[PDB]
Amino acid sequence: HTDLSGKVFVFPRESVTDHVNLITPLEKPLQNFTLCFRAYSDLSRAYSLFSYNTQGRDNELLVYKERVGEYSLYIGRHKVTSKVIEKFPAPVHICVSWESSSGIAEFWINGTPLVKKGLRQGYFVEAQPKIVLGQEQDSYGGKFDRSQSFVGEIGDLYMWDSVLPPENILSAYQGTPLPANILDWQALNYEIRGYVIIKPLVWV
Amino acid sequence: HTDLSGKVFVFPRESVTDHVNLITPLEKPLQNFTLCFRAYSDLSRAYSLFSYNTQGRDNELLVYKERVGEYSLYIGRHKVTSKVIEKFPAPVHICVSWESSSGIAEFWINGTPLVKKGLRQGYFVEAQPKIVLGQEQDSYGGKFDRSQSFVGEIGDLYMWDSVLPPENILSAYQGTPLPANILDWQALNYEIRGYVIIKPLVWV
Amino acid sequence: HTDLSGKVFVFPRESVTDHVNLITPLEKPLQNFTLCFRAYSDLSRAYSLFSYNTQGRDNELLVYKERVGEYSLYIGRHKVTSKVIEKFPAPVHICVSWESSSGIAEFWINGTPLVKKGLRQGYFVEAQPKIVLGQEQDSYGGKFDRSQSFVGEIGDLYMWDSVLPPENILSAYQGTPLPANILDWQALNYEIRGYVIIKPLVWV
Amino acid sequence: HTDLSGKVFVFPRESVTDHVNLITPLEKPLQNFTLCFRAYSDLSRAYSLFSYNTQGRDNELLVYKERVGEYSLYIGRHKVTSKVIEKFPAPVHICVSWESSSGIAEFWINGTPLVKKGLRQGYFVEAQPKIVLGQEQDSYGGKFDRSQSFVGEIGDLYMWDSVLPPENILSAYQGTPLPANILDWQALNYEIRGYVIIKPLVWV
Amino acid sequence: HTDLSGKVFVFPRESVTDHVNLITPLEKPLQNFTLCFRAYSDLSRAYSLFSYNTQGRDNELLVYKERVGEYSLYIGRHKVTSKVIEKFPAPVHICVSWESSSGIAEFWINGTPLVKKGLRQGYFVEAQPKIVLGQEQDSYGGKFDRSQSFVGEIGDLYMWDSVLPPENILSAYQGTPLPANILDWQALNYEIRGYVIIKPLVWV
Ligand SMILES: O=C(O)[C@H]1CCCN1C(=O)CCCCC(=O)N1CCC[C@@H]1C(=O)O
Ligand SMILES: O=C(O)[C@H]1CCCN1C(=O)CCCCC(=O)N1CCC[C@@H]1C(=O)O
Ligand SMILES: O=C(O)[C@H]1CCCN1C(=O)CCCCC(=O)N1CCC[C@@H]1C(=O)O
Ligand SMILES: *[C@@H]1O[C@H](CO)[C@@H](O)[C@H](O)[C@H]1NC(C)=O
Ligand SMILES: *[C@@H]1O[C@H](CO)[C@@H](O)[C@H](O)[C@H]1NC(C)=O
Ligand SMILES: *[C@@H]1O[C@H](CO)[C@@H](O)[C@H](O)[C@H]1NC(C)=O
Ligand SMILES: *[C@@H]1O[C@H](CO)[C@@H](O)[C@H](O)[C@H]1NC(C)=O
Ligand SMILES: *[C@@H]1O[C@H](CO)[C@@H](O)[C@H](O)[C@H]1NC(C)=O
Ligand SMILES: [Ca+2]
Ligand SMILES: [Ca+2]
Ligand SMILES: [Ca+2]
Ligand SMILES: [Ca+2]
Ligand SMILES: [Ca+2]
Ligand SMILES: [Ca+2]
Ligand SMILES: [Ca+2]
Ligand SMILES: [Ca+2]
Ligand SMILES: [Ca+2]
Ligand SMILES: [Ca+2]
């Protein structure tokens, strides 16, 4: 339980080895959830932001940037993509929620809502995951791909087991987030593997 | 008669099956009319916003987006198109009126008037329609086309049997519309067919 | 003598038949003159705004839009073109003057002066004209061309037999023009031929 | 000695004949010098702004616009070019200085300094020149080229036999220039040859 | 020890000969360091800003502009590149730091931080350098390349043997920098070789 307030992870080079493991207890399958964080990268190609796999299931929960201005969400291998107008390169605050009952996934880029899309209505996201920043898993905790690796900075990451209202998403964007029960940036359990450096956050 | 204030329809995936039926009594043929609503979609291709058919007549009244920045109005199979400068993707408030006596159709995008165009002077729009959101009809209530389907969110839909003055169009754009006698968002009769979800409106 | 204050002509479709005839006494050949009006059209091709012909002389005085951002003035079949930065589609207030003694023609788009150009120094523009909005004449009052027709809205048209100073051109742009002695929008003699509708001006 | 305050030269058509001769005594070779003026033209091709030749020497001192956003200075046939961000077409206030001792030529477009460049260090610009607006000389006062001719308006022209500090360049840009000892717009000796008209300056 | 406050070096032409040697004692290998300066050039090709070589080691420390919007840092032949949105041509204030312990290099363009990148973790930058402005060294003080030469103006150069905090980088950008212990613009030891002129700084 480490307090990373005002710090970021820095993945300072393209690689197939550098990454961070996020550790959560969880154990109960996910029905609703909201995830959010800040990222800053000048990659033009595609990259994984947040990779969440479980035993036997690739891309169980994956936030993945297709290209400038397109964000994709995977839920149990099914995919959904939404577009937004953004500058490049630029810092972004990404936030994504998904609700099993309706299947709706809303993206929120820099406090602006993208078009809602739907997938996997009725599905339950599997538990006891391996979660990875800086690489995209194609196995249970490994088999990475260099050309999907993330190069840049990530911080202010939070994950709740519910769907945040707009009022609460704004709070997170403005740096005063509600306390999170799946991943909290101020009490984070993480392993660093490879070349990842922790530095102060100087771009918000 | 359901009050959808502050809610929207969400057509969360491309399909040939998802759609909403709007139900109005009407019965008397339409001479003048104003239609308006909000839409938010990141489709680059063409799509139907509002499809209104009658027994034996395709595209009797159809609002249809050709491509970014071009809105078309069909009246009795005749078509008229007007251009506007818009960002993309972005939420839009569309509003369109048509007057039989003059044949003039004015479009109003986000409270800005497009160039007036004319068609079907003297025509009477047929009554007892089937009205459909989220798909484009090529029959009396069906025979849809996937590549014309609407994917995104629609709300704040109103339809009057008269032509609104500018003062009243602004009112609708600003969220304080006059009460409507053909379709009112606050007392709406609708059927949902397929995958359509109702959610709160978070983008105005 | 009809007062069209706050109204516009609407040429609502492309055609070779719709047009308006403007009627002025004149009778004395034109030495100096200023013309101005508002127009709103989303045509990308070329079109005639103001066509003024006399017996035996085509394009005696013609204001003609070549393409987006280029305005041409014809004086006795001689042509002159000036460029400007404009958005599209957008409403414009055009104003053009010409002085025989110097041959100089200045264009003024939305109150901004274009580069001055010269032509026909010493020429006298012929009298007893047929003047036409919405079509381009290739005869004395007819032989139109569909692909030069104007589609959109025109209003606030004034024509003086002198050259307005800048102070007066601004006045016209801002909607408080000096009274005009060749064509006055507030006492206009006009015939409508074909499909032309008069509607209120809603875009200024 | 004519006062052209608030007036401009208008070169109203492309030609190989229209031009203005500027007349100065000078007689002593130029070591340092600053030149400046306003110009307004919608030509996309190359054109000469200011052409200064002497007996037996082409392009002794020549300010020449290569294309949109590139200004060239010739000093004794040697050339130097600097770039700037500008809108087009648009009025510009150009100002250029050159210092023999250092060879440095600074351009100042609309009160903004371009990158300094150098040429002809140690050179002395020849005296008893023929100076021409509106054409580019390839002889001592003539042998013009149509495709280098200037078409548009020029005014507020001043030339000093020293190098103005920044404070003084701003003054000239803002319309309150120091009195000039080589060419002064308020006491100018000029011949008009061909089609050149003097009109009031309406674009500053 | 010369005070260049409010002056710049001007490399006024492309060449393989013009350059400036910067002289520092140093002698102790560099572990951390921050470098910063202002530059103004309208070159579209690549150029070296700051070239620092040591006996037997090319590109030991090199700041090098790849193209518009891309800045590269070399540390012991290894390279790292970061992107930024900039206008062109435009004056820029560049500032770059590097820390051996972490290998992290941060760029700061006009007071804005680029994405951090990493290289040469653990490395020690060699001492007793030859440092050169206006050319890129491929030997110990020479063997230049014309097509990498810098053409424009450089000034306000400072270099510290530590890593400046953000607060101090802002100070340097705003013209009130902390005193520097490797290179100080207000006490600079430099040789000028070739065509380089010192002029006042007129573009900040
Ligand atoms: O990698 C993933 O888990 C998913 C998530 C988003 C990107 N992606 C893709 O599958 C896109 C390409 C993946 C791998 C790939 O391109 N190929 C191409 C040849 C073999 C290999 C594969 O599909 O297994
Ligand atoms: O579908 C409509 O009702 C109208 C309204 C806007 C688009 N549209 C069109 O007709 C354009 C194309 C429609 C369908 C189509 O393109 N084709 C082409 C082959 C079969 C099918 C048809 O003509 O029935
Ligand atoms: O119509 C006019 O009077 C002037 C006004 C501006 C354009 N224009 C033209 O004449 C351009 C071309 C007009 C007609 C045309 O293009 N052609 C091409 C072949 C037959 C026909 C003709 O010149 O008679
Ligand atoms: C998820 O949210 C829905 C909608 O509020 C709710 O009905 C359900 O009980 C929630 N499930 C869990 C596990 O929190
Ligand atoms: C439609 O509006 C026109 C005014 O142009 C009016 O004359 C007519 O009575 C109206 N008809 C209906 C059915 O509202
Ligand atoms: C036209 O304008 C010129 C320039 O002032 C003037 O000399 C002349 O008298 C005017 N003639 C007419 C008929 O307006
Ligand atoms: C030109 O300027 C230089 C430097 O400012 C000066 O030394 C010299 O006296 C000047 N010469 C003339 C003729 O103005
Ligand atoms: C380099 O910076 C690190 C981090 O602050 C510091 O521990 C070290 O003493 C510095 N080394 C030198 C030589 O300044
Ligand atoms: Ca995978
Ligand atoms: Ca993969
Ligand atoms: Ca149809
Ligand atoms: Ca269809
Ligand atoms: Ca004609
Ligand atoms: Ca014609
Ligand atoms: Ca020449
Ligand atoms: Ca020539
Ligand atoms: Ca080298
Ligand atoms: Ca080299």
Residue numbers in the entry:
A (entry chain G), B (entry chain E), C (entry chain C), D (entry chain A), E (entry chain I): 1 to 204
What's in the article?
Serum amyloid P component (SAP) is a normal plasma glycoprotein that recognizes and binds to amyloid fibres in a calcium-dependent fashion wherever these are deposited in tissues. In summary, the structure of SAP is comprised of five identical 204-residue subunits associated in a ring 95 Å in diameter and 35 Å deep, with radial symmetry creating a central pore 20 Å wide. Each protomer consists of 15 β-strands (labelled A to O from the N-terminus to the C-terminus) arranged in two large β-sheets in the form of a flattened β-barrel with jelly-roll topology. The β-sheets are held nearly perpendicular to the radial symmetry, creating two separate and distinct faces: the A face, which contains five α-helices, and the opposing B face, which contains five double metal-binding sites formed by the coordination of six localized protein residues.
Crystals of the SAP–CPHPC complex grown in the presence of calcium ions and a tenfold molar excess of CPHPC at 4°C have been reported previously. Radiation damage caused rupture of some disulfide bridges, but the conformational effects were local. This structure was determined using molecular replacement, and here we have revisited the refinement in the light of developments in procedures for medium-resolution data. Structural studies of the SAP–CPHPC complex by X-ray diffraction at medium resolution (3.2 Å) showed that in addition to a carboxylate interaction with the calcium site of SAP, the pyrrolidine ring of the d-proline constituents of CPHPC bound into a hydrophobic pocket formed by the side chains of Tyr74, Tyr64 and Leu62. The approach of each d-proline head group to the opposing sites of the in-register twofold axis-related pairs of subunits of the SAP decamer appeared to be facilitated by a kinked rotamer at the centre of the alkyl linker. Model building of the CPHPC ligand into the tenfold NCS averaged electron density of the lower resolution SAP–calcium map did not clearly establish whether the peptide bond preceding the proline ring was in the cis or the trans form, and in the deposited coordinates both cis and trans isomers were included for each ligand. Five molecules of the bivalent ligand cross-link and stabilize pairs of SAP molecules, forming a decameric complex that is rapidly cleared from the circulation by the liver.
